[PDB]
Design a protein around this ligand. Structure first.
Ligand SMILES: Nc1ncnc2c1ncn2[C@@H]1O[C@H](COP(=O)(O)O)[C@@H](O)[C@H]1O
Ligand SMILES: Nc1ncnc2c1ncn2[C@@H]1O[C@H](COP(=O)(O)O)[C@@H](O)[C@H]1O
Ligand SMILES: Nc1ncnc2c1ncn2[C@@H]1O[C@H](COP(=O)(O)O)[C@@H](O)[C@H]1O
Ligand SMILES: Nc1ncnc2c1ncn2[C@@H]1O[C@H](COP(=O)(O)O)[C@@H](O)[C@H]1O
Lengths: 323, 323
């Protein structure tokens, strides 16, 4: 694939750019979209940012969040798709892939290389780290707001420096961004301290349905669509729940089945010390990382998905213990 | 007070040292005690580490944790007390303050300067940052285990880089320690992903008793001693609960009243954006930081402590809104 140098040249050559992130945006999406958009604007370019999805509440106080548009009305000369592993993930903007030359910048090993130019590097924990390097290579000077926005995705994708992907390069980037004015406490407060009361009630439903297997080493639970409705919640509200199940003493693998909307079952998997959940996800048609991976089924009963996923998980887990 | 330079000289002059931390040890205690003990040992000194308390379960897999003794049986020429703000906090080792010259190293502004030499610097988020600087000044070379142990206290005292005390110096220290081999994911896994099932049941009791005041800006709850007993828990198990209450959308001040043992009521206070909980704590006879502070009552009914604390909190909160 192309490297950073080729993507920097392409970005330099084009002056009307649409930067696009993926649906159901998370911290790395907002971070990467806004950090690249602002970097390119500082070079004088005419740039718009777009996500075909409602921006979640926790991002509403971030600087420049209103630059992300659902309906940009912009005819770009270049499409730049960040942190999105496949064209279906960018919603209605995938139609532009047929009309406009495109750049892909992504850390997901699952990326389908759907751009005319692709820089995909899974050694990074966050696409925001790739945007940081692109901006510095282009000559962008950071201010505090841009540093805060670029810090955001590095923090969220590492669980705020807790996960296995928080390596030396993550800590060096975070130090450089805080030195340049990133407001680390602002980011933690807005992302992690805006919990709805209903999210506590929703998690109580998860605890009620929690089941342990394999001498307590596997824990799984589920939320069906009627339960989301009962609590005025969506799958936005159950973010972080599967990590709470991983946090139980003695659990090595945590799995959460989430039905939202009706008939769409998302499977979120996390592992603690050694089990490669990405191998299970891939074999079920999904994908991810060794310690965090997922699968999405459409048109299924939760009663069919759960036993299939658990069966495959148990088979591979029992292999790993003997090895 | 004395600075770092004076304490480094004193540590250099003495070769039989007892390093002591405080009762109910947390991450910064274990981090500071072991990081200084190992640093001094690398200089060839005869050093023992002691805490007059059972070491919590989450520290049991850390390297060298068995170096912390409850019963050291050691006649030191120098006592070094780390991260303990007052002599009552070190249990039975306070008797040595009358017999042995003592050094105090602490970041708590509440420190009573009870050593013969005192280095107290509240600009640090963690005493572990002060130990890092002492060790480097003495000439200690870090290995991976020592870097992990020194990283521990910086992580735990900042809530793993979430709290208002996570400034540039915290991120630079963390980067330096990870560059020198600190296993950041190991630390997060052992400290944060060893939750007992009973802790979830205990927090459900907290949610049951949760009360909001002042248009949702104040949230408080309590755990009485019978409830700890009911769930086979101690105050070790409710660590982090008050931060969960602060995480509720719209809450500015969270307060958790904890009765453990019987008749001993600890009040934990956290604030989000602007309210100075340390001023309330101090006026009630406790102390702490602007965003995290506490008070401890002995010999009271929970029914007397709660309304007094809430009354004082409301009085000052209502002052801050007008200002
Ligand atoms: N070891 C890990 N590597 C990557 N992501 C993880 C890990 N553990 C938990 N996660 C979470 O899984 C999600 C994966 O993000 P991404 O790599 O952008 O798909 C993020 O929300 C992470 O916080
Ligand atoms: N259906 C899927 N196909 C490919 N990758 C996925 C899928 N679901 C989740 N992932 C990835 O797996 C990790 C964990 O996802 P989640 O459990 O949804 O937070 C993230 O890096 C996701 O991008
Ligand atoms: N702004 C803050 N400053 C210091 N400690 C905080 C803050 N917010 C929460 N805390 C917690 O309060 C405790 C205070 O630690 P210490 O400063 O060693 O007494 C630690 O457990 C911190 O994680
Ligand atoms: N009774 C007290 N007197 C002085 N400082 C305290 C007291 N209780 C708690 N603190 C400090 O206030 C902060 C929050 O304490 P806690 O809420 O117990 O985690 C920490 O820095 C404690 O060391």
């Amino acid at each position: 694939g192309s490297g950073m140098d080729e993507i920097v040249k392409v970005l330099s050559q084009h002056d009307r750019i649409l930067v696009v992130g993926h649906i159901m945006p998370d911290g790395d999406c907002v971070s990467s979209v806004l950090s690249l958009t602002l970097g390119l604007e500082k070079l004088g370019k005419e740039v718009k940012a777009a996500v075909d999805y409602k921006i979640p509440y926790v991002f509403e106080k971030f600087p420049y969040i209103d630059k992300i548009e659902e309906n940009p009305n912009f005819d770009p000369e270049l499409l730049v798709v960040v942190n999105a592993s496949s064209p279906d993930r960018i919603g209605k903007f995938q139609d532009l892939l047929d009309k406009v030359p495109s750049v892909v910048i992504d850390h997901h090993s699952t990326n389908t290389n759907f751009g005319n130019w692709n820089w995909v590097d899974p050694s990074f924990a966050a696409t925001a780290q790739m945007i940081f390097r692109i901006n510095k290579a282009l000559g962008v000077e950071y201010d505090s707001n841009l540093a805060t926005l670029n810090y955001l995705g590095i923090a969220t994708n590492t669980g705020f420096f807790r996960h296995s992907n928080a390596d030396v390069r993550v800590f060096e980037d975070a130090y450089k961004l805080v030195k340049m004015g990133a407001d680390a406490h602002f980011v933690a407060k807005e992302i992690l301290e805006n919990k709805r009361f209903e999210q506590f009630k929703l998690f109580a439903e998860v605890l009620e349905r929690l089941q342990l297997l394999e001498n307590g080493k596997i824990a799984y639970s589920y939320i069906d669509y009627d339960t989301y409705l009962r609590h005025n919640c969506t799958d936005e509200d159950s973010a972080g729940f599967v990590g709470e199940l991983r946090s139980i003493r003695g659990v090595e693998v945590a799995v959460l089945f989430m039905e939202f909307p009706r008939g769409k079952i998302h499977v979120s998997m996390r592992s603690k010390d050694w089990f490669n959940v990405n191998e299970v996800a891939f074999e079920l048609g999904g994908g991810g990382h060794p310690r965090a991976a997922g699968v999405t089924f459409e048109g299924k009963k939760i009663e069919e998905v759960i036993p299939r996923v658990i069966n495959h998980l148990l088979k591979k887990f029992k292999e790993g213990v003997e090895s």
